[PDB]
Structures are given as C-alpha cells and as structure tokens.
Amino acid sequence: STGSATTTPIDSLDDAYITPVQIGTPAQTLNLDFDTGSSDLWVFSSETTASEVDGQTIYTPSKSTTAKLLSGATWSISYGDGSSSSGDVYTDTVSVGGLTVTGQAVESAKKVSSSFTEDSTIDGLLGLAFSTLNTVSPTQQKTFFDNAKASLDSPVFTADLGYHAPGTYNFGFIDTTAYTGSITYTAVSTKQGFWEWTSTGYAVGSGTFKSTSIDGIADTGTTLLYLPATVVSAYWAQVSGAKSSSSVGGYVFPCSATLPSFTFGVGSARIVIPGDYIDFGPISTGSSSCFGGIQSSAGIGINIFGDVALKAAFVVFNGATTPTLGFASK
Numbered sequence: 083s084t085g086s087a088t089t090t091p092i093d094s095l096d097d098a099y100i101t102p103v104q105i106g107t108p109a110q111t112l113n114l115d116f117d118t119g120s121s122d123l124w125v126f127s128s129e130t131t132a133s134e135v136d137g138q139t140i141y142t143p144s145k146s147t148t149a150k151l152l153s154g155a156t157w158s159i160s161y162g163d164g165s166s167s168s169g170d171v172y173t174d175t176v177s178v179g180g181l182t183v184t185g186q187a188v189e190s191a192k193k194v195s196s197s198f199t200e201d202s203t204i205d206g207l208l209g210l211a212f213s214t215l216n217t218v219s220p221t222q223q224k225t226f227f228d229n230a231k232a233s234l235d236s237p238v239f240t241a242d243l244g245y246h247a248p249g250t251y252n253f254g255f256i257d258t259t260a261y262t263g264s265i266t267y268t269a270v271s272t273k274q275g276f277w278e279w280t281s282t283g284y285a286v287g288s289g290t291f292k293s294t295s296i297d298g299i300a301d302t303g304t305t306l307l308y309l310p311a312t313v314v315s316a317y318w319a320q321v322s323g324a325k326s327s328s329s330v331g332g333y334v335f336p337c338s339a340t341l342p343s344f345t346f347g348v349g350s351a352r353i354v355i356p357g358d359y360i361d362f363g364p365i366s367t368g369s370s371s372c373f374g375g376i377q378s379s380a381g382i383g384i385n386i387f388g389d390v391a392l393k394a395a396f397v398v399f400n401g402a403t404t405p406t407l408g409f410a411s412k
C-alpha cells in the first residue's frame with residue numbers, strides 16, 4: 083500500500099508545515115507537524131487543560147468507536163527548544179493520505195507548554211524518527227512509520243517541502259517525477275535514534291567547496307539550519323553588516339542585503355540552498371534588521387539540517403533494515 087498527503091507552511095516564513103491526518107472512527111481530521119526529529123504522535127485533545135488550548139482542533143477519544151485507552155501508559159516529552167507536553171495514551175485508527183494504521187498509539191496531551199498553546203495552526207506532532215526515542219512508559223510504542231512499514235510497497239517515505247508553497251509527504255513509493263537528476267544515498271547512524279548522517283562539506287556563494295565532514299540530523303521538525311560555528315562564521319562574513327546578536331540570539335543582517343547561496347555535500351553530490359531561503363525577515367515588525375536562517379549549533383550539541391536545507395531537496399527516508407538517506411535536486 084502507499085499514501086500521499088499535501089503539507090502546507092503555517093505562515094509566510096515557512097516556520098513549520100502542517101499535514102492533515104485522520105484519527106478515529108468516524109475520522110477526526112487534525113493538522114499535524116510531521117517531525118523526523120522525534121518519535122511521539124501526540125495531539126491536543128478533550129483532555130488538554132482548557133486554558134492551554136487557543137484555537138487548536140482537539141481529538142475527542144470518547145467520540146471514536148475504535149479508540150481504546152492504553153491502561154497505565156503515560157508520556158512526557160521535552161524538545162530541544164524547551165518545548166514540552168505530557169499526558170496519557172490511546173490506541174486508535176490513524177490514516178495519512180489514504181494509508182491506514184490500526185492500533186496506532188495516539189498520545190493525548192493533558193498539559194502543553196506555552197509555545198504550543200500560542201501556535202493555533204498546529205494540532206499536534208507526528209514523530210518520524212526511530213521508535214527507540216518514543217517516550218511512552220512503561221511500554222514503549224512504535225511510530226506511525228514503523229507500524230505501516232510491513233504494509234508499504236517499499237519501506238520508505240519522502241519529504242518534498244515547498245518554499246513558500248505546499249509540498250508532499252509520500253509513504254511507500256518514490257515519485258520519480260518530483261526531482262531532477264539522480265538520488266544520492268548516504269549512510270545513516272541510528273545510534274542516537276535520529277536520521278543521522280554525514281555531510282561531505284560546504285560552499286558559500288560561488289566560493290570554493292570545502293571538503294569537511296559535518297555530522298548532523300535530518301529534521302523536518304526544525305525550522306532553521308544549525309551548523310558548527312566555523313561554517314556559520316564563514317557564511318555570514320560574506321554578508322555586509324551581518325553580526326551575531328546576543329540580545330536577538332543569533333546572526334542578524336540588514337534587510338537590504340542580498341544573501342549568498344549555501345551549498346552542502348551529499349557524497350559526491352551538491353545541494354544548493356538559494357540565498358532567499360535563508361532570509362527569515364525582520365526581527366520585529368518594522369525593523370530593518372533581519373534574522374538569518376543559518377545559525378550556530380554550538381549551544382545545541384548537534385548539527386541540524388532543518389527545513390531551510392531540506393526544502394531545497396527531494397529527501398528519501400529509507401527505513402530498510404540498513405537505513406539510508408537519499409537527496410536529489412528539484
């Protein structure tokens with residue numbers, strides 16, 4: 083079997099992408115943030131503290147004829163940005179673009195951090211990292227991808243994110259019309275539970291390509307590109323007036339500047355990120371200082387190929403027994 087769903091940016095900056103997901107019987111449609119950096123499927127629900135819900139669509143297990151409470155199970159998650167949420171666990175039927183999984187763990191949020199409350203457009207997350215990272219206790223639960231793998235024509239899903247435009251998540255097949263040239267595959271380490279790989283180097287603008295290994299994770303759930311301080315300093319040195327701002331928390335640049343492209347290596351291939359993808363607009367309404375889409379990973383501990391990098395490519399997440407990541411230009 084296969085599945086295919088359109089994913090849409092939530093705002094004019096591509097801060098996140100939401101994808102409709104059907105849960106329960108009859109279907110309750112929620113718009114979830116597909117996150118290859120985490121492994122929990124959790125939703126705003128009728129059980130969420132009322133003051134902590136501000137416009138989100140909620141899942142109501144009591145109205146689903148296939149929902150079953152998973153007795154004794156709880157979950158609690160903290161994301162790398164300080165976000166957190168927690169609650170209890172149901173199993174229910176979950177469908178993504180025609181692809182159906184029965185008995186999927188649906189984690190019902192009882193408490194959510196403020197950053198989720200303020201995001202009215204995101205009804206929850208759908209984790210797509212490896213199931214070793216799932217936070218359900220005392221019985222760990224499988225992700226939607228792991229549960230569907232057996233039924234898929236091919237144990238893959240692909241991410242085709244748009245620049246200020248809708249895109250596509252496909253499960254079970256590779257759309258050979260959606261990219262140009264060839265797909266370059268590279269090895270993945272699952273030792274930390276992430277889609278972790280090694281980039282072979284980078285270039286700034288039309289500059290010389292620097293061969294150097296950059297280990298990092300492919301994370302659809304992270305907006306920006308986080309790279310080592312040496313690489314990020316080399317990029318922003320090519321932008322007149324750019325500087326790192328402690329009060330803002332990253333590199334800013336004059337909104338009048340033109341940004342150079344950024345190239346990253348995948349084996350012998352090159353993915354080019356156009357400079358316009360790196361502009362995240364004014365730091366405050368009316369400001370002439372703009373926020374950069376490439377930031378240092380020094381304070382994080384790991385390099386993150388977030389949406390800024392991924393939306394420049396067609397990305398294959400190959401969940402075969404030896405997992406690999408594929409990248410193609412588009």
Ligand SMILES: NCc1ccc(C(F)(F)F)cc1
Pocket residue numbers: 117118119120161162163301302303304382384386
């Ligand atoms: N998108 C999920 C996510 C968020 C943060 C991290 C960090 F910070 F631990 F790298 C990993 C994965």
Ligand SMILES: NCc1ccc(C(F)(F)F)cc1
Pocket residue numbers: 098115117119120161162163165197198201204303304
């Ligand atoms: N990396 C996971 C993640 C994804 C989205 C959000 C947001 F946008 F809701 F704050 C927080 C954390």
